[PDB]
Design a protein around this ligand. Structure first.
Ligand SMILES: O[C@H]1[C@H](O)[C@@H](O)[C@H](O)[C@@H](O)[C@H]1O
Ligand SMILES: O[C@H]1[C@H](O)[C@@H](O)[C@H](O)[C@@H](O)[C@H]1O
Ligand SMILES: N[C@@H](CC(=O)O)C(=O)O
Ligand SMILES: N[C@@H](CC(=O)O)C(=O)O
Ligand SMILES: N[C@@H](CC(=O)O)C(=O)O
Ligand SMILES: N[C@@H](CC(=O)O)C(=O)O
Ligand SMILES: N[C@@H](CC(=O)O)C(=O)O
Ligand SMILES: N[C@@H](CC(=O)O)C(=O)O
Ligand SMILES: [Mg+2]
Ligand SMILES: [Mg+2]
Lengths: 252, 252
């Protein structure tokens, strides 16, 4: 499998997940249907999205790490799948939620070769590969802001901060893409509980880095050894390389 | 003018503003074209939205209080207009932004008779009149959550908080409607600067109250005497009546 295969696979999944969600009334979407392998409820919207995606991934030689069904398959290519990132928004009709996929040549983030996040409500397509990062077929890059007085996505502000704007949209994969395309100047997840899982973050991280972003853990450490499994957790500090160290100092 | 006139006028404005914005590429939307009477820049998207709305309101006997052009006309019915609430989102292609209208029989919020907020990206229509509050033609009401451990929209969290979720979407009028329809359990704007203007909040406040919500200033004081002018500022605490007093105690 190469990056072209991954793009093709991702686009087919996006199409099937989009069709499955769009036809589901909010009343149905919001229903709990079971307990996910991640230890949070699987909503009916989560279930239909994952089935749509797994139906396609099942044909490939991959090991899938996915929120609801856990680790599936035995292939050498690892796929971190979030079949519906932003479930709360989807069940409320708030148009920020997406399907997220990151493909790696091992079970570690450093061997990632493809990232894909598709907004299921708007049809916006973000992806990145060896040639760079894209939004709807157009090359993107992070902003060049150097000041802390900037436009920040942050989970969660717990003190007075110097930002120009703070936003929290409820879809980490999509929000990492808002940072990747320069819509926002930085993305932070500094929750002490360390809540982000590998499938929430992996594609967004890969896309943001291809777009020029510097993206690390809380203390500046590389995310390269983050594992494609259900147990992995992440804090994220993401910004261009001039802003990034200021962000690190800010949160000490 | 009564509440049926106001509904008809609002729908006409929504249609015109919607097509004016939808046709404008992001790179055009984001351009500063002048200084607004509110003291913030008018973007091309703001100007185009406002001209569309004013062309319609010009035929009515109203005094309009609007963000970019200020106070216009001499009619006895006052209209607080935010031609595009969530301009930052609109210029970035983030689908949470709306046109907001509150109609009052004086220059005070207590004399409001109609509120209308239309999401320009999704086409969701929120309004309220003597018969109640509506989302896309269906009656809505606030949630009945009684615990602080709830789903909150809050500008801005500056300390550790007990919420289940915190969200900040960048469109106060629309966010007040997310609260009105029960999608979120409360809306708070507790920014010490007191940043909200009458046209940001008036329609959202009126819709939320019609939906059963209790909505007050920071100290629990009524919003009735808030004025339809450019100088007015608001902090907001909005929740059902069981949750509301707990929030008041929380933010001391
Ligand atoms: O998939 C979700 C989503 O990314 C949310 O925005 C984030 O707060 C949660 O931690 C994550 O599980
Ligand atoms: O119209 C805007 C919008 O409602 C934003 O969400 C809010 O943060 C701003 O204060 C307001 O001016
Ligand atoms: N992924 C899209 C196609 C595309 O973005 O080109 C879809 O299948 O709906
Ligand atoms: N969240 C979606 C609702 C849907 O498509 O069912 C939207 O308003 O864009
Ligand atoms: N304002 C809408 C109509 C409606 O809200 O029902 C439009 O003309 O696009
Ligand atoms: N507020 C300005 C500058 C910025 O926030 O980047 C804008 O909307 O473009
Ligand atoms: N501002 C975007 C919102 C969206 O992608 O739906 C637009 O042009 O419609
Ligand atoms: N999924 C949410 C539902 C809600 O907060 O209303 C929960 O854990 O309760
Ligand atoms: Mg998910
Ligand atoms: Mg505005």
């Amino acid at each position: 499998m190469d990056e072209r295969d991954a793009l093709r696979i991702s686009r087919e999944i996006a199409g099937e997940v989009r069709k499955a969600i769009a036809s589901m009334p909010l009343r149905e979407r919001v229903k709990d249907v079971g307990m996910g392998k991640d230890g949070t409820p699987t909503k009916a919207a989560d279930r239909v999205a994952e089935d749509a995606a797994l139906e396609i991934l099942r044909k490939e030689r991959v090991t899938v790490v996915t929120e609801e069904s856990g680790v599936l398959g035995e292939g050498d290519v690892f796929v971190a799948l979030d079949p519906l990132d932003g479930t709360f928004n989807a069940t409320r009709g708030i148009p920020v939620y997406s399907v997220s996929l990151c493909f790696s040549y091992s079970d570690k983030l450093k061997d990632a070769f493809f990232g894909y996040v598709y907004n299921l409500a708007t049809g916006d397509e973000y992806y990145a590969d060896s040639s760079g990062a894209y939004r709807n077929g157009e090359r993107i890059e992070v902003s060049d802001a150097e000041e802390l007085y900037c436009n920040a996505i942050i989970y969660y502000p717990d003190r007075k901060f110097p930002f120009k704007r703070m936003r929290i949209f409820g879809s980490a994969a999509t929000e990492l893409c808002f940072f990747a395309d320069g819509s926002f100047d930085c993305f932070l997840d500094i929750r002490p509980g360390k809540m982000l899982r590998i499938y929430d973050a992996a594609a967004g991280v890969f896309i943001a880095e291809k777009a020029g972003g510097k993206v690390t853990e809380l203390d500046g450490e590389s995310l390269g050894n983050k594992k494609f499994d259900m147990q992995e957790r992440l804090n994220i500090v993401a910004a261009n390389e001039k802003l990034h160290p200021k962000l690190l100092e800010l949160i000490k």
